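Lab notebook, entry 1178. We have the chain sequence and a SMILES string for adenosine-5'-diphosphate, and the next step in the workflow is to get a structural model of the bound complex before anyone spends time on docking refinements. Request logged below.

Task: model protein plus adenosine-5'-diphosphate, output structure tokens.
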Amino acid sequence: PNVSRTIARELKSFLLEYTDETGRSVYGARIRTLGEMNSESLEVNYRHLAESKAILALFLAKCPEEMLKIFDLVAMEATELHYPDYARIHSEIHVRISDFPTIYSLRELRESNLSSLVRVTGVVTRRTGVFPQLKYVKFNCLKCGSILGPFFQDSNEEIRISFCTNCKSKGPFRVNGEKTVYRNYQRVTLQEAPGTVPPGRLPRHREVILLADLVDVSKPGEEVEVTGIYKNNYDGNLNAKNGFPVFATIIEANSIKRREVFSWTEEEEREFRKISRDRGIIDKIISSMAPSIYGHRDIKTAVACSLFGGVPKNVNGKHSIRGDINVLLLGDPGTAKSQILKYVEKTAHRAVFATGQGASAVGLTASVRKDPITKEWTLEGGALVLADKGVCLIDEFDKMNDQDRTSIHEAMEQQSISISKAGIVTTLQARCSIIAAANPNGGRYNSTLPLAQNVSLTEPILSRFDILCVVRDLVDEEADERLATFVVDSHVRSSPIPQELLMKYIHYARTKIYPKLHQMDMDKVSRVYADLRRESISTGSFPITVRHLESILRIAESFAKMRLSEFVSSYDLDRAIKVVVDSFVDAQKVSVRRQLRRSFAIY
Amino acid sequence: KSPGDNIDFQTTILSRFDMIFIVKDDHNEERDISIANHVINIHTGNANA
Amino acid sequence: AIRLFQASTMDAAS
Amino acid sequence: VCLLMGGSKKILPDGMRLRGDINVLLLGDPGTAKSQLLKFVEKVSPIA
Amino acid sequence: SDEINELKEMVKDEHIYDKLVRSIAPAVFGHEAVKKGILLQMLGGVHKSTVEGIKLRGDINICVVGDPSTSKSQFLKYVVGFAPRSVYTSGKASSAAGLTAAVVRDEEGGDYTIEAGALMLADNGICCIDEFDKMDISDQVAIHEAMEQQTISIAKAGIHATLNARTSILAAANPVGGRYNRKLSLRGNLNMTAPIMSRFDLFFVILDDCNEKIDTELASHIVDLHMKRDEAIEPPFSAEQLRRYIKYARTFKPILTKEARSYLVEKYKELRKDDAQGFSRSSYRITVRQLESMIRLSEAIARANCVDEITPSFIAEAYDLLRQSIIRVDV
Amino acid sequence: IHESSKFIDQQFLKLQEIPELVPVGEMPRNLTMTCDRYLTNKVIPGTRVTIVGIYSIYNSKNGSGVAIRTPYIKILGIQSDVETS
Amino acid sequence: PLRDLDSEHVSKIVRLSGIIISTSVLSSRATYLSIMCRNCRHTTSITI
Ligand SMILES: Nc1ncnc2c1ncn2[C@@H]1O[C@H](COP(=O)(O)OP(=O)(O)O)[C@@H](O)[C@H]1O
Ligand SMILES: Nc1ncnc2c1ncn2[C@@H]1O[C@H](COP(=O)(O)OP(=O)(O)O)[C@@H](O)[C@H]1O
Ligand SMILES: Nc1ncnc2c1ncn2[C@@H]1O[C@H](COP(=O)(O)OP(=O)(O)O)[C@@H](O)[C@H]1O
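Result returned:
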């Protein structure tokens, strides 16, 4: 009862004069910080509160419910003596606590644990949208006029509004839209983290509730932590059951802790700029691009190039060409061809994994589909729409049903997916760079015969891909040495840029810089094209075309972005031409050996 | 090959269609430099625009 | 028009 | 050009009506820009 | 306490490996290959680390192939008989899930209760499927999802989910014509799709051909079996003890730090060179995944012999094993 | 009396967020609209729009709990994208 | 952003953009409805 009117005082002393690590009050700083940030959420280490006074902590253990109601009010008046004008905004600060093992994983909980504070860990699964909650409840009545004024209800009761205001009946109460304030609310199905499962038992769904500032913070596919109060509520009728009497359980969450959000910043960028100035940064980056594979210098080079960017670039006012590099990575059983692209899903900003089909959601074709359980029909994009501006990552084209094939083709062609069903009619815009993994028909190298003959995918869909990475080879003594040492090294375990700064680097450059060529000295390129074109017509077909010229330029300016160069330079050209020209070389039949001899001046 | 006979097994398609334009690309350094230089102009410095 | 379509016929010939 | 502008359209009796306007085939090996050209027509034409 | 003495008595001897091998499947007559093939599934690799990162495999897989009447099924029945946490299905009738979870809805009172079922209810264990060739496309893909991503993701018209199954899969697959086809590539013979094919290491193909000594031995042995006497045919190990033995052998964390691992490289290296030309040999490649396979094989034999950090010799045993598994593909 | 009474019209649009971005993990969420009189039929489904409206609440029937009330947006008024077509 | 709506936006002018999935069959509401008591035979009107 009013016993606790003592308690609240003590702990606010624990708030205000508490000093640790060379004094310098932490919680005073806490309040002053929020503060103008105005985050209305105060966070308390349980260690401190356990240390100073234990019975506090134990009264967090037994019944934290009303305890926090004791805590937050005076937390507020403290904040008010700190900020005079803050009483006006947000009106309340409720606290998240911090650390209380326990650490009941998920599965082990009994009725002894309910109503008592409990921390839990586990993976976020699909969660409902955001809803309002009544907060201050108010009643306009009917006959007895108005306003009957704000009341506090509730979690979760909201009752009974028995008798007031003239009467109290029969002109009784109906809540109104105006002058009732709401707070956000959400449900999260949290299941036992599949890693720590003991063999044979299945991880168990347990339901979490989030309120206030907690809402929408957590994202699915991430192991999350909550520090809650385990409760057996509610609804509760459940006069349906009957036998035996059984109450459902719900973890009501106070807090959220991430597994266990990235952006460039002034100090970090002013630092940053000085790194991009060295020429060799390119090579360093490529070497950083796929660490654990040991890879190749080429096949990673393509990745870096396409992942890093291009220039869109709209010609007033008509056509934008394309600002992306579509990498066909043509693999070989046992070659790394899968793993590489998987890297790209970790590093890139927006990167989507559609697999082949069958499917690992998403499934590559925008379609308007009836929703799970019973719901209205929602539109959904394929990997393409979802991944716009980002990087779309697909593997095993050969296993794809034509229904998808047409979709990818269309996406590459016009940079937009059109959907005509059902009544909904649009064109969504997918600007995605496609990176692909493909598997040669049959064996490692199916024939001396040309690439288009080597693999099943038709030539026209292939033409859309500028860079083709072929992988080989026949057994090599040293190559097998070099590889095996690396693999063995990996399994036995049990110069390049730090991954974080590169994965920031890319985003930074793509956002800020838009390199451009200058017409004056670049006419050379034209000559080069000719030098390539005619001499290549004598042997092999076709494949060369002005498209395959344009890819030069675009790739070049991608490198110009890695240089952060603001304009196109001859070095960039050198790099590019080597990339595309060797790409073209390596596609052709073994007669391409004859080709190699003229590559020297191009080298 | 015969000019028709291209589409499936049947030329009837080409019969329905009024104006059929076969486009050819042959390599002529004069013309090839023309088209190329033109594209270099197209990308940027937007001089074409 | 006659000559334009004539170019089309030239396209029909090859 | 001559495509976009439509043509003679005749409702003349009997119910038979002749049409406009024609058709165009761009067929040929790549570098023809036809697939881009179509994007252009798509832009120009009032409804496309 | 009283039994641990027996366990010691087992680890002491130098033959108990051979005792294991010979004592595995009494019903079956010989073949000596698939004996090892069966046991080395029961005793798996480290299946752990290497972080940061993605985790290594770990476990093992086998698919027995051969002309029917070869009693390839007797192995299976013997495994579902012998080892706990083992599910047996005959799929074609899987039918679908089957090998995955429903999930069960409603309950009532909130539902999202999960069916066992089939594959996943056997976890950290050996699941035995007859006839991969009968289940067509639908489920095989699911199995691939089990042996690639290692996790089973389940979302149906309701609560989304992820349920782990870490398992070994023993299959018995009949050839296209139920025969060889010696001259044909095994790649073309088994008739299951490429990605699931490349995850099974290795096949241990059996074909039975007529040899009058062996023929006489078969007729003798089978008639023996159908005789209540003599049923006196007995393995050097009893079926009951071999379990407590194995479970003991499971508690080891075999790790090879040893730099004789360097040798393994040349062994990998010795393997592909001679098998490079011709390509008309059993290749395969030989895929790096086979280097990766030699590891789990090694650790398996370590589990077998209780030895830690193993020997280059055991490595050579796993090696030759893979070799005959290759040569049987040569013809 | 239905002969002397005068009536008007009401649409119930339903707005989804652009499927492009940024769910990346989830089925993208939507809100329900109500348009009265002259705001009806202004919009064909598929047309990208920007609504000025009054965020608000109804009770309905739990599909939920406890006291949860599903949101919807009363629309006044609507300015379409131009054209877009 | 449609994703972000606080509960402090309630009964306040909020503007946002998106893509309409579906529009619904028109319905009719009454702005002016003249009413009659059956027994009393009294007549009135309610104008909303
Ligand atoms: N040189 C290598 N170093 C390290 N790992 C490798 C190397 N080559 C292949 N791998 C591994 O082997 C796997 C081969 O799978 P992959 O053949 O790409 O799949 P799919 O055939 O389905 O496309 C990859 O996941 C990769 O991690
Ligand atoms: N005369 C031209 N002017 C400008 N660009 C051209 C010209 N001819 C071809 N191109 C280039 O060719 C590409 C269009 O390829 P296209 O011939 O349509 O392929 P496909 O014929 O296989 O559809 C465009 O990127 C464009 O830059
Ligand atoms: N080595 C063996 N050991 C035991 N039984 C055998 C052996 N060889 C053949 N059999 C007999 O063959 C039958 C099994 O046939 P099997 O090869 O399993 O046909 P399928 O290939 O269609 O499964 C058994 O009933 C068994 O009696």
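Notes for the group: Residues 2-13 of chain C form the longest helix (12 residues). Worth checking against the assay data. The pocket of adenosine-5'-diphosphate (ligand 1) is lined by residues A 293-294, 331, 333-339, 395, 437, 439, 483, 487; E 195, 288-289 (CB under 6 Å).
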